[PDB]
């Protein structure tokens, strides 16, 4: 019955379910980022040569560069029967608050972890800004998640790759003392009571200091029917506004402003609740956050289910056996070269007794002299001289080195190309666009376009706080994937150039060229050309 | 070797040893912060004990 007991039951179930895949993913990350010689603190370990001769890392670098050369971003497009520019405002807002370094870095981190381990992820969060807000004195930013395989535990009963059917999800935060102080400061928690949770790491490297403080954030999605209030817009038409979004703030300010309630329907939607939990108590209970979706976007490589168990893989898991075999064989051969006697003659001491200074290595003599006689045996026994055999690498070692390297080269071929990995990234970006659209509808000031101009209908409460008023006719655009851009002007330039490259030299060619000069950026010479192009378009009507 | 000296004279036959704790007393302890170290390690993964233990 306890909230903590229910939360911990769910977390324990998911943590136990996702155990094998997480362990393999952590091993792949360690293998491809720290050292291919695993098993630190093996009790039975002496000092022996352990060299790291790498063949998987150039492949991983090649794949990561290939994925980086072809960026993918969200592209909102108008729905069927919607107004032809139903997506311009949302696209502008997305480009505005997703142009920073943080969004790009989060996507890059997730992609690199997808290539190596098999799963990455990132997060979307909403912050308050007063200097450069996207809208409504707020911003939506994207944040990275490092080692998502162990730091994001998804609801077990989710059979979808993007995890859009997951009812809850827990994200584990590990912090040092100062990190915990800042965390408690930012969430208004008690910094004196040190928190604790499941440790998602492993003392697998001799890192001299490891982290000690753990918290968890538990997100849950509740889908229910809630009351909506149908009004009549003082300008024209009838809007629909959620009762919970203006439950106390402006319920009478609407009436004062001139909104008359027409009816009241029950509409089913989802709400997202966050809780800050340690292993002993719940610190924040059900803090409601903006949006309908869990704000975590996962990216996968090779993904599937085997027997009610989710498995994912990157590009490194299959090559590990061959790489480890090659490292071991090269270490054995290095030991052969180091600790093996060299090729030298075998002498009896009496054979060279007295001429011991001829074989030390100097070149002062034209030959070598040997003793011939012994007093008690008449003459020294005659036997051909022997030399210690030269060190040699065994045929087994040579064959195994060649075959292990060949196996690694044969199995470390993602795809034929990264088409499937780019498609999984595109799926993740589409889910990201869905989440961003929901959060925008929740917190941002979305203008409605009239065909009679954008009409932003909002009002302020008695506490000077402004409550946004978004109608229910909000999902006017769907999500596609297109080239990554920084601004709507850049996107328009790309579209005009694409049209230009395909239009033959006629009158639309002139139109498109003048349009490009119109949309071009500003200096002095380009300013002159843009003024001329505007004049020409206007004078051509 | 003399560079490391920390007393004036060496122990010279029948020198009296003065005991400095003569009654029961709880000890106050001062130090320089680097004088004490706490060397820690994990239990080795493949130890003889912890054999089939996850």
From Swiss-Prot, chain A:
Record's subcellular location: Virion
UniProt keywords, alphabetically: Capsid protein, Late protein, Viral capsid assembly, Viral genome ejection through host cell envelope, Viral genome packaging, Viral penetration into host cytoplasm, Viral release from host cell, Viral short tail ejection system, Virion, Virus entry into host cell
GO cellular component: viral portal complex
Transferase is among the record's keywords: no
GO biological process, one term: viral DNA genome packaging, headful
Top-rank lineage group of the source organism: Viruses
Family: Belongs to the p22likevirus portal protein family.
Free-text function comment from the UniProt entry: Forms the portal vertex of the capsid. This portal plays critical roles in head assembly, genome packaging, neck/tail attachment, and genome ejection. Procapsid assembly may initiate with a nucleation complex composed of portal and scaffolding proteins. The portal protein multimerizes as a single ring-shaped homododecamer arranged around a central channel. Switches upon genome packaging from an asymmetrical conformation in the procapsid (PC-portal) to a symmetrical ring in the mature capsid (MV-portal). This change of conformation may serve as a signal for headful packaging.
Subunit structure: Homododecamer. Interacts with the terminase large subunit; this interaction allows the packaging of viral DNA. Interacts (via C-terminus) with the head-to-tail adapter protein gp4; this interaction participates in the head completion. Interacts with the scaffolding protein; this interaction initiates procapsid assembly, thereby ensuring incorporation of only one portal ring per capsid. Interacts with the capsid protein.
Protein name: Portal protein
Residues of the full protein shown: 5 to 580 of 725
From Swiss-Prot, chain B:
Cellular localization per UniProt: Virion
Top-level taxon: Viruses
Resulting phenotype, residue 54 to A: No effect on phage growth
Free-text comment on this protein's domains from its UniProt entry: The insertion domain (I domain) plays an important role in the folding of the capsid protein by acting as an intramolecular chaperone.
Entry function: Self-assembles to form an icosahedral capsid with a T=7 symmetry.
Quaternary structure, from the entry: Interacts (via N-terminus) with the capsid assembly scaffolding protein (via C-terminus); capsid proteins and scaffolding proteins form building blocks that assemble to form the procapsid. Interacts with the portal protein.
Family affiliation: Belongs to the P22 phage major capsid protein family.
Protein's recorded name: Major capsid protein
Organism: Salmonella phage P22 (Bacteriophage P22)
Taxonomic path: Viruses, Duplodnaviria, Heunggongvirae, Uroviricota, Caudoviricetes
Gene that produces this protein: 5
Full protein: residues contained: 324 to 377 of 430
